Design a protein around this nucleic acid. Sequence first.
DNA 1: CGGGTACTCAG
DNA 2: CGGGTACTCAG
Lengths: 322, 322
Amino acid sequence: EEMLRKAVGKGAYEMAYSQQENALWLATSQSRKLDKGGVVYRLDPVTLEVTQAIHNDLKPFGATINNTTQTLWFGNTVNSAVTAIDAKTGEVKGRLVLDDRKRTEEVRPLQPRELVADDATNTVYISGIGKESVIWVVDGGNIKLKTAIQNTGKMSTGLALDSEGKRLYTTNADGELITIDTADNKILSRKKLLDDGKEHFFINISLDTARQRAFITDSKAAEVLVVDTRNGNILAKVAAPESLAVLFNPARNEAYVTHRQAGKVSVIDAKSYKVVKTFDTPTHPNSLALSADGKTLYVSVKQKSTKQQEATQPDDVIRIAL
Amino acid sequence: EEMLRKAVGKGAYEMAYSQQENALWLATSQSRKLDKGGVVYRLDPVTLEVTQAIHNDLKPFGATINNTTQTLWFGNTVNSAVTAIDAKTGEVKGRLVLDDRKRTEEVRPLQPRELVADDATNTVYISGIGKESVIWVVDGGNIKLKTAIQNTGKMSTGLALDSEGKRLYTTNADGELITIDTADNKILSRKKLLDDGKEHFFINISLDTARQRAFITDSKAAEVLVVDTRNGNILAKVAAPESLAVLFNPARNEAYVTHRQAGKVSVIDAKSYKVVKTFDTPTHPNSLALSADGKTLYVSVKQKSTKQQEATQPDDVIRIAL
DNA sequence: CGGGTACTCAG
DNA sequence: CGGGTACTCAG
């Protein structure tokens, strides 16, 4: 039983793991006022040492990997764009702006948040957030846009994919869960999960296609929801601090959840729907990543850092031996 | 017709003029994060050149002069204390703490705001502000406290004196005007000047004993009030920006008023009760002072300066040829 | 996207 | 004294 916490860089965010390359990648936006653009770090799965540092014109935040084409996709939040990088060589394949509009007092260009790649059809799904969000469907072949699934709602940040079942889910700040047919990119349905009049922001969603379950986090409630991907019925409400990121682990039938303010990572037993362990990870745990065999959990951890009183220390990645 | 604006120091506040010494004194608290204590500057009445700089252990804010004893009295706001300085030599005679309690989560030691000296009886009246203000009556002879007129109200900042009529007035944040017999230091009455349900903060009050009038400023209304010192009847409501400091000028039967945000100084004609002229004085005019013959007006002017983003420039004193 | 941090001789 | 500034990969 080990826990290795190692420093990597400033502005740590999401990661992506690759069995083929036997590597983990970390997206970092670097220093906010001192750096222009950012860096995607290739880290050793065991020692967490940086084995490669990829410099990017645009700051990378969200990440995902297409295991078939061994291509990493990074969301460039502050530049409303997405980046493609070849995992094998670390070369920037190219970028595609998802919203060129200029920020004014009457316009908020949508910004990418989460990314999911359908290995089977080499498609990249990107959630574009704003007052009225969307879901850009990008072609991983030429890096050009195919279409923009409209009306996903307010701050529709969450995004999960069932490649085989051709179902693409997304959660939002309207307390909705939205199911989408990937075959025609059309919304099949949307249900308001809870109805206790309270405010709910379902930031993220991870799937367990095997049982057609979906683990959804809440940033405004102290409970992670487990939903039936077929009818949106609540299958369980796990008690935990307000959640952020969530990742389901088929190999151990359990889900990990990051609690930003709490500075904790929760281990939910997907059989009993009970928090069986809590990893203490201050200051602000951010994203999660799993080794191909689901034996190792990777957590990115951000330093306390106001955007007026920036952190002088680099963020860390915590490798946990599950 | 001239207007001379000259730099003096950081943290400018109140002034005091002396016919005998033919000088103006400016109280400055100096730099907020860089300086401990402050400086009282002796300035030439014409050129505004600093002819003497008095260093003080405690930062001076409010000021007043006892023309009989040629003694300057300075309120040390942040140290709940008052300072006596000999105008002739510039020597610090001594200090008297007006509230030694220590700042905690349940205690706000009262802080001196305004000061007035009764030349006839060598007494110094000091308004001590807080949730429930008071008025310290200090003995200008030994610098020891005589008593503390209690219950002046919430933020009873204003303070004026009719030495001959043994009447001491004070205004507060409860919209009250309070009359006090200096003979027994007892409150004779208190009236809520306006009754329009609106919030009123009568920050300052200057008197025209000759006609038993009182010019009172309002920091929450765009109108300076003129009151009858005998019955608190509104004698006039002059239209002007929200006011701060106010000074009546017997010699020209007019009153000057400082409008902090407005960056203006208003000249109110005390015969017609009309603003007959407005001196443009940005950024933040603070206090007023008059030459013994009421021919010259002196305004202290503070630079824009947040207490997190301090001003790099020193404040100015504007000498106006009325 | 639309309203809570610390300030204060400010009101 | 007791509630409005600018932040934002935050919720």
